[PDB]
Design a protein around this ligand. Structure first.
Ligand SMILES: CC[C@H](C)C(=O)C(=O)O
Ligand SMILES: CC[C@H](C)C(=O)C(=O)O
Lengths: 310, 310
């Protein structure tokens, strides 16, 4: 039994924290939003994969200083608040705790590492999951859920890193989730970028969810062209993606229930979009490697313009 | 004194027809929309260049068959209705009449020529003008107005073509308008594409007019990148554009009053967008020449998706 801290309990942190708690883990949730609703009513999950689950009462906190020291810290906040997140992580971390960033984008761990003690293990978890907040304290899980974990930084030699990644994967597999130990975290992040870069931004720009985007020949063609830009950029930066990865991802999204990506909800509620991690960082890495992504570049420009308007 | 027929009296046909009529020309207007409002109240112009002008009564018609034979036919309709326009043009044309397409896009005359007798002269007129319909029968002219004319097809040898283009330019110059006889109609159309391709589509996609688009660093950078794609495509198809044409066009739009391109109004009223002439035709010409325009291609895809939605 591990003591798990969830720093940022949105849809992502709520889902994985509840799943771990239901597998018998000791999970402590840090709430910045919905603290009293959740500490009242608890945490509920409607899931087309796992059925209905409820956590009540929940070990809930409004302040990281009140949390007990945790051996694993799952970070489910958006990448936009990661700077402000570091003191909360340090406060809740037991000595040698493992920090797992259940976050999308590129370069996330690298930008957080300067703010975390080198005695902490820093890992990324790429979640392929259709999940969003419903009513307060209610998580709506539509499909998937698997987590690809990888190691970024920490006081672990090269054998120990593989061991720690497996320990993390086993946590999720023990909870009934698909989980894979990745050899290369950056390669894993490029894999997830091929999905988030087209679908997150186009859902905002075209005011659409996955099903209309895939039913229309023109948006389907645009999504595939953007995918090939990310695949190319990754190759230019030294990362091989699997053969025919674009059709592989396109087919999974046709199978996918009609889904609004997180960035769609962010723009719908006036929250800041995750542009820095999902677009700016890959574009800069692609530029430094001499590789141009014209469609992604223009999509990023369009999203920055939309964010600056009324 | 020429007898002028205006086939399609929107903002563009209304403006140039009224200006010609005010210079003493005998102008006959074909109205598909606002016929009874215009035949009632007449045609009014609020213009920051020419001041207020009114045409009342107007020689108005609901049917091309009622029009007298005209020596010049000014076509101010959108490019979307050009197929249906041909019988109206043939009906209103005097023998050897000149047909002048005051329309944007590429390949417009080529697609209309099969539907017009070869005894008619077919010309294009590229209008650089900020104009839109206000209240019914009222034209709102914000800036510019110049017309670059060029010859496409007709029963005229090579000397006569220059003469006819000059005759047309003189018509507009005699009415107080800037007008230039172009040696090459297709080159002139590529020139105007550098403005319409970015600004028309981005105004729809970003729900914005020219001033916010130019005030924002990201949209300004995107507009310039799109301009360079069109300049490159034109060069690939064998047409040289003037040196630094992009900055030349960008500076004119900074000077320009806040302006909603025609395509913005089209999408706002549920009218079909001019995608075929402004995007599809240049993209196909660029493809046939081995030149790729990734941003324009993606912009075109986005606009086709938006048109197919609710
Ligand atoms: C299956 C991919 C899923 C939609 C996801 O993980 C995301 O929204 O980023
Ligand atoms: C000056 C360019 C003007 C805005 C125009 O001609 C158009 O809308 O197509």
């Amino acid at each position: 039994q591990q003591r798990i801290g969830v720093i940022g309990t949105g849809a992502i942190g709520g889902f994985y924290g509840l799943m771990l708690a239901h597998a018998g883990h000791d999970v402590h949730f840090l709430l910045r939003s919905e603290f009293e609703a959740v500490n009242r009513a608890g945490l509920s999950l409607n899931s087309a994969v796992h059925g209905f689950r409820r956590l009540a009462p929940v070990q809930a906190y409004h302040s990281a200083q009140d949390m007990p020291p945790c051996d694993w810290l799952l970070v489910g906040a958006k990448t936009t608040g990661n700077h402000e997140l570091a003191p909360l992580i340090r406060a809740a971390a037991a000595p040698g705790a493992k920090v797992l960033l259940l976050q999308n984008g590129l370069g996330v761990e690298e930008r957080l590492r300067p703010l975390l003690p080198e005695s902490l293990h820093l890992l990324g978890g790429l979640c392929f999951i259709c999940v969003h907040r419903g009513e307060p304290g209610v998580i709506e899980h539509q499909a998937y859920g698997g987590v690809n974990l990888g190691y970024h930084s920490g006081p672990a030699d090269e054998r120990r890193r593989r061991e720690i990644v497996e320990e993390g994967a086993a946590l999720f597999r023990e909870s009934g989730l698909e989980s894979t130990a990745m050899p290369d975290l950056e390669q894993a992040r490029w894999q997830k970028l091929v999905w988030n870069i087209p679908y997150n931004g186009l859902s905002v720009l075209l005011k659409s969810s996955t099903a209309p985007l895939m039913a229309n020949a023109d948006s389907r063609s645009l999504i595939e062209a953007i995918m090939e830009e990310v695949i190319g950029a990754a190759g230019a930066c030294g990362f091989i993606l699997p053969e025919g990865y674009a059709d592989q991802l396109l087919a999974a999204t046709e199978r996918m229930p009609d889904y609004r990506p997180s960035m769609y909800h962010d723009f719908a509620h006036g929250r800041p979009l995750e542009l820095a991690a999902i677009y700016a960082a890959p574009l800069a890495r692609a530029a430094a490697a001499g590789y141009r992504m014209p469609r992604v570049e223009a999509l990023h420009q369009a999203l920055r313009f939309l964010e600056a308007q009324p």
